[PDB]
């Protein structure tokens, strides 16, 4: 999360995280920071029990390199997470987000396993019972007109899936916005 303590403040700043991301350079080393100090610096002091327990799993997948330290390169990826920048960059970022957590080629069944990584039926609305039926139903209808499995170019096609799906994914793919989910 963050230490600004105010969603409204973030909206006004529209770049609060970015400014601190550059400032840490003067305080934090050139490009080396631990995960503990990372979470401590950003926040996670109180009012984060089970929610923290779920963020740990997401953190490992979001880490990408799944390392025990945060390098300079990680920050670059982090910036893309908070924003989107250029549309071309967004597409690369989308693929990078997955950082190939498998052996390549993603089918509907695998997608159901990734889902936990994104978000469960935690939301009060949506997912009448399970989000999995939504992915299969949209996937089945699309049928990609052959080649159901997702390759490289089709990889981006996954985001096309559905706006309702994308809306939930958008909330998941973020750093400080996550605070919104906690409030929900």
Swiss-Prot record:
Disulfide bonds: none annotated. Keywords: Calcium, Cell projection, Lipoprotein, Membrane, Metal-binding, Myristate, Repeat, Sensory transduction, Vision. The modification Deamidated asparagine is found at residue 2. Ca(2+) 2 binds at residues 99, 101, 103, 105, 110. SUPFAM superfamilies: EF-hand. One of its GO terms (biological process) is regulation of guanylate cyclase activity. The keyword Ubl conjugation does not apply. Its main location: membrane. PROSITE patterns: EF_HAND_1, EF_HAND_2. InterPro entries: EF-hand-dom_pair, EF_Hand_1_Ca_BS, EF_hand_dom, Recoverin. A lipid is attached at residue 1 (N-myristoyl glycine). Ca(2+) 1 binds at residues 63, 65, 67, 69, 74. Detected in the retina. Detected in rod and cone photoreceptor cells (at protein level). Also present in certain pinealocytes. GO terms for molecular function: calcium ion binding; calcium sensitive guanylate cyclase activator activity; guanylate cyclase regulator activity. It comes from the Eukaryota. It is found in: Membrane; Photoreceptor inner segment; Cell projection, Cilium, Photoreceptor outer segment. Ca(2+) 3 binds at residues 143, 145, 147, 149, 154. Residues 13-48, 50-85, 86-121, 130-165 form the EF-hand domain. GO terms for cellular component: cone photoreceptor outer segment; membrane; photoreceptor inner segment. Pfam families: EF-hand_1 (PF00036), EF-hand_7 (PF13499). Stimulates retinal guanylyl cyclase when free calcium ions concentration is low and inhibits guanylyl cyclase when free calcium ions concentration is elevated. This Ca(2+)-sensitive regulation of retinal guanylyl cyclase is a key event in recovery of the dark state of rod photoreceptors following light exposure. May be involved in cone photoreceptor light response and recovery of response in bright light. Homodimer. Binds three calcium ions (via EF-hands 2, 3 and 4) when calcium levels are high. Binds Mg(2+) when calcium levels are low. This is Guanylyl cyclase-activating protein 1. The gene is GUCA1A.
